[model samples]
Target: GGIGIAEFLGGKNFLITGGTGFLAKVLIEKILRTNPDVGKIYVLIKAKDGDAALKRLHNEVVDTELFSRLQEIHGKDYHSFAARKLVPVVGDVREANVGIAPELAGVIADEVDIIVNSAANTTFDERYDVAMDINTVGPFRIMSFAQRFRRLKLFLQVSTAYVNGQRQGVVLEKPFRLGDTIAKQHKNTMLDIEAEIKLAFDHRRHGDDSASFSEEMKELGLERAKLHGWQDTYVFTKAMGEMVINSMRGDIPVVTIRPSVIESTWRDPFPGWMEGNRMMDPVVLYYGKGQLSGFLADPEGVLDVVPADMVVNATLASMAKHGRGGAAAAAAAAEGMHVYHVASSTVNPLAFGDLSRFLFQHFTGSPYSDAAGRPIHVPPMRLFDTMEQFASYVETDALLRAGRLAGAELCAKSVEQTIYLGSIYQPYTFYGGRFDNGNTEALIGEMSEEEKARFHFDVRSIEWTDYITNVHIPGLRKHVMK
Candidate 1:
């Protein structure tokens, strides 16, 4: 009755920035594997030349375990098979026209059907100027350039739902306004971002040292972000980035999909594929080792975790729907820029307490091995309501500080991490908001059962206990931990 995802993407070209990152990797893989002839995929890259980018794409991206299936399907000529359609275009999002050659950008401007601006500095506390340029201003630049493409169907922005800015409980999928409290304060803030950058540049000019100046700017970013009510520099700048979509890109059809606390794959391309120890990874890693014994968090607080594959799948479906002449094309036009919060809290939630208990059970029996081939013995973990008290405990405990406590696999350096961990993780561990995904669900409701099976973004199907014990933790141990 409607244009299915496969048919919608029959011959569409995609200009996807942030291919260097993980979600983009999954997105590319799904597009190619689902429909190899789904138009030319131009990956925005930062390499010196196409040759260099192609090589990096091969050795670093395609040759990895993530694309093992594609490797299996193509056998000896996998690279050639992928090389035909999966292409690299030299560019950085921070640069004009994504740093691509003028000719290429011009061609892309004319031909590209969809432009997904996924490139961002995800660093929570990145330096002010650098983060602003890549996160906030970079999207502005992409929107600026995207306006030229007459046939452009969708300017999809990959954002985070936590952009709600320190709010709690059932955050809905809607356009956010910083409002009167921030109106006057933030009125000139957009234009002044560059002015602040100039300050850093002027400092660099005087000191003749780039590193120290950047460090100072990073502190500035952190302080300002805190003062403005965001949790960190990443979300604050990313929220600013999202605002530009509304201000600019009036003509271009845009959608912002905010994915919360993205973790390893639940299914597809194999389970538990994670790049690094991100979000809660380090905590579990250290805790399993009997290192991080104390944590300050609301044990009752919900953690909104979503699989990377699901996020990519949702994004792909959204692209097909909102792309040129797709099923929801008219609906998309009617509503304008749609924001969907792809999350697990509303469907399948795991409170911090149960999550910790599950980890303890898994770690108690199976103490993951350390670097020196030693089995880390697990110990009891103490949960805290306040970080100050936790820090006090860490500071006063002579045994922990001296690393003399038995079974304390990582207490040697726990003292070094107490303050740093508290400052960075306190907000997340104590996060209060419940992300509403009615926008995401409404789309899923329109799909046929078969479509549902193939393109499953439904979080309700997950069993949190089983996923953590069987899929993710095992995955981290096998792929990311070592």
Candidate 2:
């Protein structure tokens, strides 16, 4: 059971950016459908008009069976509630002042209480300027706008816990301040290195006469990004965004909610609800398509995943308690920031090795059949330290050679064979990671036993085998792969 709708937030005007995105859609829909009495939800949409945003909102956000559970809750009244509560404000965060019309901006400045900043270019390999424009500098602009709201209660910024970068072992709940000098290093190093970064991208794109840009630059960016303890540009820029918010938020109550590797819905507006697996989809598809068959990640490491709806629930709870009243408010009045780690407990974490095993078993039993009904048996999993090592062994293997002699392309054929092996082994390997979700647990600890029962954040409570077979994989095939 999870937290009930009535206890957390009953009435609150929310300004949510990126409401059409996967996580945002779930959050908005859940609030409207489950907590009908909740105040107006002003969705900040980057569109030409309200109609355009509404069309996208309907097609991408509301049309999915994801909202079926909501419909059940509201019966026939769901549509009316959705139409009234969800208001789209056509705007762009990348432009100055979020490119909002003066009248609309004034309304937000006066009326909006909570701002959920969720818009960003989530690409790991995006151009530096593009990444900075959307992920880094954009939040600074939003933060500036937030400061203008005299009645602003809470500003919740979504950040990835992978901001710890290439770090392993226990990642703490507190934000990592690499120091003022290190902060200066970003503008000097990252901004100054723009030309070099562009040159590398151009070289990679054109394959021209210029010297092959060493993978070193990419590696360097990754290294520097991780030095601040974030994984890639996505996480790095998000951390920068958080820092900018910290600087600009001032007396405005702000909470940075960091979620790790978000997956499909557990129980929400509907169970097994999911958008395309933005991150996990590729891995699953590769195995299904027989392209990639193995990986080198730790099998026993914790793969921290919180359901989409659970995350939304936690966000709402945090906002209800911390966003306006009680301790979070006092902290804000005292000019402090509240940080919550929205992650699953590591005590009984899922393992990648187990996840891979489960996926292979499920897919093999009912192999992915193409339109013509040809069976595509997903492969078993394998482990390697590096891509090069995997490629080399797969390329020269005797079985691969034998298959090639029979007319199949050796490497390609090998991938197909290896995929079967890889897919079977993946479940156990990919689900490994230890996430310390202590802060999240502590925050929810104060709830009544019934409230605790209603607001479930217990990842360890999940049955991995059942979830993978009946829920995750089925949802993936139906929504993501299709």
Candidate 3:
């Protein structure tokens, strides 16, 4: 129905920031694997020199098992195939011109067709200065740099769906205007980006009291985020980054892809291929290893998670649709801003209760090994619906029973810390907003049949029970357990 994906990408040069990250690696691999005739992929990595950046690209992105499918296709000549395509550029997003050398910047400006800004500080409670610099100011610098690109057709920013903050009900794929806030408590409050940046630097405490100063800064970030109506520093700064995009991207086609809690690939390079522990993996790991026996969550609440590959598909499709070669390019050329939710809650919901049951079933069948090599049987997790119940239980009963188990004393010494972690994680576990993917669905509908076959982003096809029990847990066992 629209432009053929492979055809559109055949000779298009791409500049991908955060090229060494989880989502970026999948995106790079997909583009390289699907369209071997694609132009150079300029991957921006944080390093001191080009050689260091290249090393990171090889060790972190190319040589990983994530690229095994491509390896199989190219066999022993995989390195050559990779070397021909991936061009590593030493850079950091939290700097002017994204820290690219002037000569290299000129080449990128002239050659690049699309700029995918995937670089971000993914920490939720990060220090205010660092978070604002990386999440807020970084995007600003990238948008400024994008103005220099001679052949740029589209500029895409990868953000998280949780940037909607604590808003309830169905959250739509909508762009946040400058000074937007989610809290009704501060309905009349307006956010000023420059003022916030100035405040962060002016109040930044440096030198000898580094430990205490860092803690203070972290607390200050959370305080400021709450004051501005967002739940945490990460989402608050990211929302501000969206503000920067909207304010600066004049006539440049821009697409913001917000994927909800991304997990491993479903079936791209391979099913169940996950790297380290993602958002949900740590909780699953603790539960499986018999460390976490009780959880604080609303059993009926939806956990909006999508496979990493599916997110990658949506990103590519959106890029094609908004780029000069696709159908929607003309429409998006002026005004030129689109937000798509690459999520699964509205399409195929996976509730906490179901996930808990699936975890129990999987771990019971194939239990995790204890330190002494014996199989540790997983007990059914006790779920508490309210924080009061959870906190009280952990504070009194769990702490008291800490002496019975082998390593229970370790849990005993941290009852307050456990409650604190639970409090911070509670908002997501019982999250009320169901992200709407109207734009993503419409984009998928316009794709040609062949494109849809290879680049599948349909969430309806996912089977929760099977995916969780078979693919997901086994992936953790193989790649992340150790």
Candidate 4:
């Protein structure tokens, strides 16, 4: 089955956007490691010229320890092997034609088979205009570019599962129609994507100062997100991105992979391989250092997380299943779009309380140390059941509390920072939705045992205790923690 996949991908040129990103790196590495016969991977990275782009690819993608396995396979020939397979393309998805040179653009348009758009502003409360530019407008721009592709089989957009917004119960693998708004509370306010774009741009034009301008824009993004019922600008724009793709992808076989909170690697490349801190890492870090005294969260709320490698696995499996030509490809085009929620909440559950316990145990065993080399004692996390209670605690208790070693001014600043982050991250701390991965499940169900082993993404097989305690926390300490 592994060989079957490799053969299927033989000589297929791919255009991967956000080629320098974490998810993109994993995907690129996996493809190169697994399929030696695959065609050139045209990596789209924002750079001034081919030389700079090539350098960035080498420094950011190839030289990274994430490709250690591939390095071992080729030994001294690894650099030459990478040079042969990875082709750097200077471009920015936010611009028209992805800012690609006309000659090179035309070349890729003719040769490219798959266009994987992973470029996105993942900042939760990013400047509204920037978020819309990269997340909402970016996908539309890529779709326009893909329209010129002669051999285009699939256009995959990596989105987030949290695009379901402030929804409860089971969130289905459904595509967002044009002008789809999540919040029922604001049904009266119509969501026109172009108008939203215009508003953000117009608002951005009148900046007062650097810090204030950024702060104002950040608030605007949060305001806009809340108005639409999403937790933040990232997910809100991501949802709009999906709407844009769904509306524009006529006759194109499009696949949207909505991955949940992406953590460390489970198996591929190397177990526990990760780049930076992801969603839950901040909680772990703050909690371990004894800085996070209290927070608002539902103890039983489900934190839907999946390993990065598994997300990559699901991505490849979907590509193979849908990208292969003939009836399947034809029918996929006819079907318009396929939305797959690569998540773990539905099949394998991990509650917030369970996570707390795991973290508590891990920290107790291997506590984080202070600057002076002394071990920082971690305390029990205080969970507030209501936002009101949490807000009151932050305003009063946090401001007056003086146990830790810090000045009054620093303490005040810390309290301010806590409140700021708390407001932005409150929704996630109390997330109540379970992503229904029926589509993803069916995709996994058809995989042969060998295929499963080769491209493993079965979330049900993940043992939370071992994964959180042994794999993930250790991985975080090794790769992310300072």
Candidate 5:
């Protein structure tokens, strides 16, 4: 079924965190560019100064060339359209109460209808104190503020599907108890240690006498934080944030949207609009550059990628229906939580190995060459080993020793080229676990087909091949490349 193309968010004020990020940008663009009638969008931005954040928000988010399609669609009114809807609120979520100023706090409490808590430190190796400050305590503080909103229609908490934590089988759409297991064990101890760690860092920043305190405190805090079930401080603290939402979101319509490894835009105000390729983009770059010839990943492992536009659509659609008077509202009425897994369907799950092969075929042409530009005339679909091994075999044994004589640096350069090409070719690698969206599906069913198609909230109808070759790659080349 198609998500409708009309304005669903005609008159609703939205408070979104992490609005400069890839997915957040798409969501902001889609709402402002497509659903022009939507109310004000207050984005929580972190910067050295308020003016700096505003400058970045304008140059990067608004004035950038990514919205060419939107400009075309809306004619000369795109800039005005964006300016009217998008508002940048400077604050750090890590600070107490998201560091909101008195005036802004009053504005948010009085005006905002829906709150989208998407700000989180995604780094796997983030320091525990920093991660907990932003990811755990930050969300709690945000929710506390949202509770103060008199007209709070919906509070959508954006979370990761990876919170399932090394799941092999299917993961259900429900809240896993973090407080019961990990938090209870070390909450008090971590709080005390984290306070000391912060004090030490503050001392170091202020040029205090405690020179070695910062590093030593960081090490101690990280060690203590990792003793819980998290692979890193980032996810561990985020898990705690989820618990905070579950415990304190009283009588405010809250829906937890857990999306798996988010990829580039599928479709919306613009097609294939992506920021610099981080996360999976790096892996693809490795393939394109020929640095990564092969992978140790499971062949049949599912690459669960929900496009940014699709996720935004799901968020809005879920909010429109469920946030109004459905299960989310019911939960709010009963002082409970509504958890929805905003992920791709399992039936059409793409495989990592097949995806790799598809990318090689699509991006890299036949008749492979060494760094010296000597053609090897290898057939398509030939898999190689690691980057080092592949470089040695192709350059030394296959090309150079065979009288081709391509230099080592040349070979390495070629590998780099291949990895970049591979990245472009196979953008959808490094994913597993289908995002079961039965809850989202049920919610969408409530809307009329016309309304559904207008908003473009449904993901089941997306054509993977067409999306990759036509829309996604082109956008990436135009926007990401210098």
Candidate 6:
């Protein structure tokens, strides 16, 4: 027999890292609305004063549409409801026990029952030390903190699906082999990885050539990551985090969720609830604004993306199922750990060409009106079949245009965008393979009929055209651009 989410979460306290982030915001609201009686939520934030953190949480997070449904649910007692539920703790993930005060740490270790480590550094081209500390070693530190929690039942780690590194075809819901460097290599050698990179980095200087200095750093990070068999530091270090958890899990119930590119919301708490420009968000944003031109890509390449709400749904469902409060925990424990890829590529694949056409059509139909209410045309994207053609075109066509507009308003902007465009984006366009969501599907299959209807996260349910045109684009203008 199975139990409902409320029944599962009821009277359980939760300690959530990255409380101010997009995913964490939705999770707080999900619990406040659905698991209102799930004891208290201790949210960790990096703030000067705990009151300031609470204020920021209200002005930024609770004030947004993510909390609208909860506000309605609470009615006249919204503030009272929220104040009682959300307890903000000023802390930093880059430190021990997340750097919480001794008195408060004692409370958390004693009372908190579940921990969700969502803190991360998602920058693809970030510094080696920063990426290693936050993405790779940060989770391990939190896990150590989790060890102190007397009643800890579940420790959920949110990881990216791209942690599989540079590969082709369907990525299975399995262990990461790129960071699987052991036996021949030292079992715990990631610190030396960061130290070696740091040594080389120390030899270089900014010397008033900030642009060259920055580019060199990005290049060095990518070079080291590839040498160790990862595409970049972000995914590479994230994989290392998973590896650390798997090795150190030590009977503490844990599950790692790997989500592909997370987009706007699809349905309830309504459609298209997205904040910040993450991954493809900026790519589509600038393209829609006519700021971007042609790019090299395989039109048939699968872009594995999913809605954030679905991710939150999958996460909540998976957590509820795997928590010590549930029946499946026994089997999950016997198996040691669980890794699920909450992705859409396999079940709901959309080609780059198809997505481009949809963008053109959507933007053309409902053009973005400027401050003066003038509509800008979204030009059709020109997809280059090869990087050779792309490089040639950039050298000639793009350069000539900038040369023609020399000493004019558009000249500097065009030159800069063109220069940095390839370094950040073009490589991702060449990404091949679909993600295997076998574990996620099986998890969904275990859900009850009523559970499936209300908290649906199945990728097959997505209607691309309907979502892109009506929901997503408008959301970009209203929630994001505005």
Top candidate, metric lDDT:
3
- Candidate lDDT scores, in order, read 0.77, 0.66, 0.84, 0.83, 0.64, 0.75
Q: What is the lDDT of residue 437 in candidate 1?
A: 83
Candidate 3: the clashing residue pairs are: none
Model 2's alpha-carbon lDDT is 0.66
Which portions of model 5 miss their true places by more than 4 Å?
A: 1-8, 69-77, 181-227, 325-332, 365-434
Candidate 6 vs. true structure, TM-score: 0.88
lDDT of 5 at 345: 42
Clashes of each: 0, 49, 0, 0, 33, 0
Worst 10 residues of 3 by lDDT: 408-417
| Candidate 6, number of clashes | 0
lDDT of 5 by residue, 83-143 (tens): 6777878887876557777787788778878888888877655555566677777887888
Candidate 3 vs candidate 6: which has greater lDDT?
3
Candidate topping TM-score: 3
lDDT of 1 by residue, 171-226 (tens): 78877442311222322233244454564344455544568876887888877666
After TM-score superposition, what is the CA distance of residue 419 in candidate 6 from its true location, in Å? 5.6
Expressed as tens digits, the lDDT of each residue in 245-360 for candidate 2 is: 77677777788788876777776555677776566666766666555556655655556667775677677667766665555545534555667777764555666677678768
Give RMSD (Å) of candidate 5 vs. truth: 6.1
Error of 4 at 462 (Å): 1.0
Summarize candidate 6's per-residue lDDT along 230-325 as a digit string, tens digits.
Answer: 677788778878877776666588888888887778886888788778666676777776555666677888788888888888888877877754
Candidate 6, residue 70: how far the Cα is off, in Å: 1.1
Query: Tens digits of per-residue lDDT for model 3 on 280-345?
Result: 888888878855677888888899989887999999988877776344644544764689999888
TM for candidate 1 is 0.89
Sorted by TM-score (best first), the order is: 3, 4, 1, 6, 2, 5
Runs of candidate 2 with Cα error greater than 4 angstroms are 1-8, 73-76, 177-229, 326-335, 386-389, 396-434
Q: Model 2, residue 57: what's the lDDT?
A: 68
The 10-residue segment of model 1 with minimum total lDDT is 178-187
